[PDB]
């Protein structure tokens, strides 16, 4: 149903993911670092790409929640690992 592909430019202070949800589109996508108590809003880019720019270094694994345009809300824990690979697709 839902996949997260790590996009180029992703580094310790920038996470870029191509999010593809089958039969729907993302209205909002958020991430939470394994260590972190707070969800952070990602910014919608072109072609399903969502990005987050961090003041401090980001450390995965990364949890995501989202809201689809049709109104579906979900959360997926530890979808993208700490030591992720750019170009790799991660799925629940």
């Amino acid at each position, epitope marked *: 149903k839902v996949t997260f592909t790590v996009e180029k430019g992703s580094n310790e202070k920038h996470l870029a993911v191509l999010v593809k949800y089958e039969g729907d589109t993302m209205a909002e996508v958020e991430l*939470r670092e394994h260590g972190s108590d707070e969800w952070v809003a990602m910014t919608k880019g072109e072609g399903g790409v969502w990005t987050f720019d961090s003041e401090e270094p980001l450390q995965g694994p990364f949890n995501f929640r989202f809201l689809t345009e049709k109104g579906m809300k979900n959360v997926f824990d530890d979808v993208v690992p700490e030591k992720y690979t750019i170009g790799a697709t991660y799925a629940p």
Partner: antibody
Amino acid sequence: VQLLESGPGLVKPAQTLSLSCAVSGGSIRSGGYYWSWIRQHPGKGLEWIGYIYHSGNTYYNPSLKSRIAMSVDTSENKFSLRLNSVTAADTAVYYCARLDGYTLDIWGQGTLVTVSS
Amino acid sequence: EIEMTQSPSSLSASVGDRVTISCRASQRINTYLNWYQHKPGKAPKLLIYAASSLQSGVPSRFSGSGYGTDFTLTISSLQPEDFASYYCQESLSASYTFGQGTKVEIKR
């Protein structure tokens, strides 16, 4: 999707309170949700116990975490709570609930547990 | 930790009254804000999410507003079955902190 609490309504002090929540109309193994336990003690508000992701990740109320163990069983489509070393302060109505990342949209009916004899 | 504080603690209002209940977050939480109704002996019921979205099947008399710190649940025309405790809840943090509850009683 529907949730139903089951387990003893009477637990002896210092023993473990065990409850299970049976999920129907949906598969826990599919992911997408945190599976939650929330309770209410008599004159008090709603208190978080904790929540668990089906992969195993668990999030506990810090004031209870030492006594709390939650589990999930994907094969039986249920998730459970064990709260050790209970006292009368754990007498409460215990609710299981589904958390979609944002909201607790589906709840069980609640089950009373009296810490006992 | 985020603290969620509701006002008033309790109120009595008549059938047909417009009733409002407030919820204040200790830090900015945008619209990461839900409202629940809890009738004793029943499961809590999600009324509102994302500050102003009405949960499917919840009656139209319930509405929500606000952004950031101060939020308001409105019951546009109170019905006698609406006595309950009502709870806000933040969804910015992984604690999903509940407010302390506001008890609504029916004046007659």
